[PDB]
């Protein structure tokens, strides 16, 4: 079947997920801080 490469689509989505995780890891690693935005931990920033 020509008109659509489902496998390509699935691989693209998995790649996006992996890259998301990689960025999450790298920022923490470089900064040395577990908290870099309000998203990481609501109560952590307040405390």
């Amino acid at each position: 079947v020509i008109n659509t490469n489902s496998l390509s689509l699935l691989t693209q989505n998995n790649l996006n997920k992996s890259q998301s995780a990689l960025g999450t890891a790298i920022e923490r690693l470089s900064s040395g801080l577990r908290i870099n935005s309000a998203k990481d931990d609501a109560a952590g920033q307040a405390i």
Binding site: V1, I2, N3, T4, S6, L9
Partner: protein, 49 residues
């Protein structure tokens, strides 16, 4: 949803190529046999003469 639409609408080239081949063979044989059949009754007409 993309996968669903694909399952619904796309044409399967595996099947369609075979269909085209069969149709081509059928058409050629049909022309040949039509010519032969027209010709023979024509020679029957020559028989009549």
């Amino acid at each position: 949803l993309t996968s669903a639409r694909s399952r619904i609408e796309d044409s399967d080239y595996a099947t369609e190529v075979s269909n085209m081949s069969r149709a081509q063979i059928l058409q050629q044989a049909g022309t040949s046999v039509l010519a032969q059949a027209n010709q023979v009754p024509q020679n029957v007409l020559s028989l009549l003469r």
